[PDB]
Design a protein around this ligand. Structure first.
Ligand code: ACO
Ligand code: ACO
Ligand code: CL
Ligand code: CL
Ligand code: CL
Ligand code: CL
Ligand code: MG
Lengths: 266, 266
């Protein structure tokens, strides 16, 4: 439950930066690590400091000489034709394309990324990549290298932060979330050459001016991510432990990405 | 049916930066005004761009020659002895005092202020006061003057951003919320001696270190404000109108504050 008395009731003693730091280290997070993090704050139990405590815990373990990455997706900038949660009437679609504010990395909020991401993306020295729908944010040693020159088309492909993490043999940390939140599997979708290309649209700043920009991407499908996860855990290497009440998973990104790639091909 | 689904169903046509701007001007908002704003995003009906659209619209009307203020309270940094929404076990109280992260204006999230406020406070050039519980954020001409040197004790009193708005002869804008959100009437409580005083605490950064700090504030009571609002409205100086579906009010802060002060003494 997300109701606060349920969250408090689910906890024996407060989670603090210190208890979270200790839990992260026991799980295997280390100084210098490159790690992309996916989370649910409520899954942990009651935390003194809320999202701030988790971000500060992560930074305390990883440090400046490591790199933290988080997806900072902004799907409400997408073309409303495809919307289902909820869908909007068809008479709104062109109004939306004409009026939805352009992606601006320092301004545009994330949607369905979680409070930990909203907190993290506003930290000083956090760098955001340039994609109106599928951006990422990063902090630490490789933050610039990982976020720079993201392509508009194939947002999760070979010219994405996912590929840069892959190149650096980075880790994926899932905090109280499952494989449907594992963005890195999108890179397996692209490399499989299986899933379908679709025409997508989003508002960007182009020539110092708002344009509704059309481009090409994959119709990424998170349901096959969960299937991959189930199989990956029966076969591949993944570490599991708890942060407060959250069941967490830590894994090498290259292991899951390569497994996913072969899975999609069959 | 999900919150969002009902929001869409109660909207005939999408709210945009342009329709919100147009509605704001229609209501009476003008270039160069000093205005403190309180809002519910969902009350407007469906907005293309959500919180961003509302902030941008306010900025387009007021301009940098005016000033926008919003409360940015972070009450989850306070001494848990006083918590009721929700309370936590007493065994936790010292742990929390020892571990809750210190307020840092560019980082600490708000509680119960709304997505509009969360968007506004991290927007570029927006400035936030120093108070660890009762801070305010501002943008524009008097942003720095309004937010500088807020006293630790009596966070809503004669040295708070509320007094500075008062001296500037500013306005209050309520967007789909009632008098119980009208923070400025806290100033009336302070001046009349209405509400009770309490020992509170919070953590700050002082001389480079996290210090848990004790101080005095008033136990501000929102319920009183609604009765006051009723009576002050009868007196005829509140402009009312809609922004999308939101019932909005625009009034002079001096006028409501002076009325509330009188209201409490008698
Ligand atoms: C394939 C892809 O690429 S998908 C893109 C990748 N996506 C992700 O990484 C998302 C991963 N996270 C998730 O999927 C999550 O399930 C989410 C974010 C959708 C929802 O998780 P939640 O825990 O409900 O939300 P979130 O993490 O934002 O936390 C806010 C909640 O924390 C709780 N909370 C508030 N304060 C505290 C505190 N001090 N301590 C503990 N919990 C708290 C509240 O319940 C709050 O819920 P509310 O806003 O309804 O009141
Ligand atoms: C006296 C004092 O000092 S009290 C302190 C002063 N307080 C304030 O000024 C805050 C005033 N506002 C309120 O009190 C409000 O009632 C709140 C903010 C407490 C509740 O209002 P809400 O409309 O529920 O929340 P909020 O304004 O944050 O908007 C977020 C909601 O908008 C809705 N929403 C999201 N996107 C959109 C969109 N594009 N268009 C329209 N609505 C949307 C969602 O349902 C979201 O709810 P969720 O986050 O639970 O999914
Ligand atoms: Cl590493
Ligand atoms: Cl690619
Ligand atoms: Cl869990
Ligand atoms: Cl601290
Ligand atoms: Mg920023």
């Amino acid at each position: 439950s997300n109701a606060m008395n349920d969250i408090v009731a689910s906890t024996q003693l407060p989670n603090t930066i210190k208890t979270i730091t200790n839990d992260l280290r026991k799980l295997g997070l280390k100084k210098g690590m490159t790690v992309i993090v996916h989370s649910s704050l409520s899954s942990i139990g009651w935390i003194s400091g809320g999202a701030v405590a988790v971000v500060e815990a992560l930074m305390e373990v990883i440090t400046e000489e490591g790199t933290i990455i988080m997806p900072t997706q902004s799907s409400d900038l997408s073309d409303p034709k495809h919307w289902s949660r909820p869908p909007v009437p068809e008479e709104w679609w062109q109004i939306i394309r004409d009026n939805v504010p352009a992606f601006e990395p320092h301004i545009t909020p994330t949607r369905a990324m979680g409070k930990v991401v909203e907190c993290f993306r506003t930290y000083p020295n956090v760098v955001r990549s340039n994609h109106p729908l599928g951006s990422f944010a990063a902090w630490g040693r490789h933050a610039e290298e990982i976020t720079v020159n993201q392509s508009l088309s194939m947002s999760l492909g070979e010219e994405s932060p996912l590929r840069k993490i892959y190149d650096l043999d980075g880790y994926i940390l899932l905090i109280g979330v499952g494989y449907d939140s594992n963005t890195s599997v999108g890179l397996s979708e692209v490399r499989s050459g299986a899933c379908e290309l679709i025409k997508v649209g989003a508002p960007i700043i182009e020539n110092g001016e708002r344009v509704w920009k059309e481009f090409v991407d994959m119709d990424y499908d998170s349901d096959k991510f969960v299937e991959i996860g189930v199989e990956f855990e029966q076969k591949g290497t993944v570490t599991m432990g708890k942060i407060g009440n959250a069941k967490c998973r830590l894994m090498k990104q290259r292991d899951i990405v390569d497994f996913g790639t072969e899975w999609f091909r069959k």
